[PDB]
């Protein structure tokens with residue numbers, strides 16, 4: 001349970017994703033690649049772009065092979081598109097292996113790259129079912145496991161930022177670890193608790209209960225997972241279904257009522273500040289998500305602090321103060337346990353055993369009174385089915401799966 005070479009191999013800027021160094025081609029071309037458990041394509045910038053100072057140059061690689069097939073990926077925010085191919089890929093601060101993987105060479109995009117994020121591509125770590133153009137395009141991790149002796153598991157320790165912040169001109173730097181093929185015991189303390197992967201597409205899980213400062217939200221538990229709940233390193237926020245979001249905001253507002261913030265703050269569109277070092281952490285409640293256990297009728301809870309859901313943003317004009325963005329937001333596509341959740345925990349994506357593990361992170365931000373926690377078991381007599389069944393569209397139904 002030691003993977004020293006892979007420790008601290010993640011970097012990034014607060015709110016702009018965590019990236020790992022990868023190489024593509026022969027000889028190896030280094031790129032910084034966003035670690036994304038909410039998508040399934042390995043897609044890299046492969047043409048000039050205003051926000052890229054470098055890109056994958058297919059012509060420089062002796063081992064590049066064109067698949068003679070394009071790929072077009074629209075999404076809520078924007079789109080990326082390009083040409084499919086294969087090449088040799090390695091992770092310099094990962095396993096000592098080289099694999100031939102599918103690579104989508106991005107030739108055109110809109111609102112994909114982020115000015116100053118310092119990453120040039122995305123490593124989709126989710127399953128084939130959500131790959132583009134379709135599930136026949138083998139994802140990177142599938143190729144890694146098939147071609148090498150790497151165990152079918154990876155783990156993420158995402159370490160967030162905190163005041164005092166170093167710089168007033170740039171965003172806060174973040175760090176973390178992606179351990180490929182194993183669990184590094186130095187990255188967590190206490191017990192490691194597992195929740196089943198409900199279905200292998202996203203890393204989908206089931207939330208059975210939600211508490212805000214130990215107060216149950218008392219909703220039909222299907223509401224917590226409407227229309228899914230997923231663990232996504234490629235989302236910054238904790239994102240909650242509309243009804244759940246509204247209930248949570250009401251509870252957090254009530255707990256923090258000594259302070260009256262503008263509506264903009266609760267919408268994530270405005271910062272609130274306190275004089276350096278005086279942030280009243282204790283007026284903001286803890287949030288507990290109970291996840292279905294491996295055993296029927298069991299659950300465990302992960303508990304996060306305001307140090308996780310209030311994101312530090314240093315303002316140029318207000319550099320004397322500690323300022324924060326509310327990082328819980330409304331979803332219409334289910335619960336997303338993003339960086340806000342993941343920064344509290346060491347998270348084990350145990351694909352081999354179709355389960356996700358959580359343990360208290362050795363790097364999580366906390367104070368002397370409260371800590372992020374992972375606690376269980378909680379037993380429920382005749383526990384209900386909290387899973388939602390997404391209505392089946394005709395187009396989805398028409399798909400053949402040979």
Ligand SMILES: CN1C(=O)[C@]2(CC(C)(C)Cc3ccc(-c4cncnc4)cc32)N=C1N
Pocket residue numbers: 015016017018034036037038039073075077112114122232233234235236
């Ligand atoms: C929710 N989600 C996305 O919208 C997506 C979809 C994708 C098509 C891969 C394009 C993309 C680009 C940047 C970020 C990003 C991530 N973190 C910070 N800033 C931007 C996230 C994503 N991947 C995920 N998981």
Ligand code: NI
Pocket residue numbers: 400401402
């Ligand atoms: Ni058929």
